Amino acid sequence: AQNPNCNIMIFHPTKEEFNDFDKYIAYMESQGAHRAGLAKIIPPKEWKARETYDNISEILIATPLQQVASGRAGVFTQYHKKKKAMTVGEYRHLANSKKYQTPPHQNFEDLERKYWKNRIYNSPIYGADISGSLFDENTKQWNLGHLGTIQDLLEKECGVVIEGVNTPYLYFGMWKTTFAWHTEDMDLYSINYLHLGEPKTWYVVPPEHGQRLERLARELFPGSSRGCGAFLRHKVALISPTVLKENGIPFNRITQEAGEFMVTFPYGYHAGFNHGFNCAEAINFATPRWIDYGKMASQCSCGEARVTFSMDAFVRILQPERYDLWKRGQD
Ligand SMILES: O=C(O)CNC(=O)C(=O)O
Ligand SMILES: [Mg+2]
Ligand code: NI
Ligand SMILES: [Zn+2]
């Protein structure tokens, strides 16, 4: 069995191997990449996402989210407080202000330590989940706005045509902005390109061990667990590496830099934080191997998780028994 210790693998495709996205994902899997839950892909040196980032300041962040924490330094939840709209250029200035800028530090490790020690005492503002793309239309390779859609994959595998579309989202981050422990909707893959700015640190639990993380989370967030049998779908809970190690949960960590892709694999729980002002783009995708994960994915039916239009058909076709209860939570 390839990659049996479930380590995060890093790939360096040539320009020729960068042509066929599906083929390269399948290649990574042949080498065991999926066992980690997360892989890094460094594009060939010839490749570029676009010519420059000099003209992005007028993009609008209609609903910036202030991430307010509750709990203890290693075990906390976050809620999102909506703020007034601002442009990317306004957000970048805010991120660089004395209140929100990255502190002096020695290296990524020192910064990680400062994050875990101090995150809860601050409320950073995240420009997350903005529909759009920064890939130039002429970029032909690994262009997240031109991937095959999940609806087309389900149709190809299962023969059923369904409604829905699949488009990318932009994330504008600052120091301490945080993504809570989660897997993707319907335990899909995700792909994330860091377009510009400061790094993003990731933590991941191998898919084969995801239920260990779920059991710990039920213990650590006991009111939340009573409220919902899949509350990590709410994307609000954080658990530090120190706490995971204390409880024997297998995981790995890696830092993504500007110009790099990350791929998360079906049912690979992940969480992380941004080092300073940055812009990432991400989208969900599927392969034939995903179908069995989609069929088995947990669902939030308490009402909190509230998701996209396109999830309806996935539930309806892959999980018909769950459909009626799930839809009541959507309505
Ligand atoms: O970048 C972020 O804030 C969160 N991204 C992801 O969870 C992903 O790309 O799957
Ligand atoms: Mg602009
Ligand atoms: Ni994700
Ligand atoms: Zn729920």
Curated annotation (Swiss-Prot):
Catalytic activity: N(6),N(6),N(6)-trimethyl-L-lysyl(9)-[histone H3] + 2 2-oxoglutarate + 2 O2 = N(6)-methyl-L-lysyl(9)-[histone H3] + 2 formaldehyde + 2 succinate + 2 CO2
GO cellular component: blood microparticle; chromatin; nucleoplasm; nucleus; pericentric heterochromatin; site of double-strand break
PTM field: Ubiquitinated via 'Lys-63'-linked ubiquitin chains. Deubiquitinated by USP14 with the help of TRIM14 leading to stabilization.
Residue numbers of PolyADP-ribosyl glutamic acid PTMs: E16, E17
Cofactor(s) needed by this chain: Fe(2+)
Keywords in alphabetical order: ADP-ribosylation, Chromatin regulator, Dioxygenase, Iron, Metal-binding, Nucleus, Oxidoreductase, Transcription, Transcription regulation, Ubl conjugation, Zinc
Domain JmjN: 8-50
Binding site for Fe cation: H182, E184, H270
Record has Transcription regulation as a keyword: yes
GO MF entry, a single one: damaged DNA binding
Function: Histone demethylase that specifically demethylates 'Lys-9' of histone H3, thereby playing a central role in histone code. Does not demethylate histone H3 'Lys-4', H3 'Lys-27', H3 'Lys-36' nor H4 'Lys-20'. Demethylates both di- and trimethylated H3 'Lys-9' residue, while it has no activity on monomethylated residues. Demethylation of Lys residue generates formaldehyde and succinate.
Protein name per its UniProtKB record: Lysine-specific demethylase 4D
Organism for this UniProt entry: Homo sapiens
Residues of the full protein shown: 11 to 341 of 523
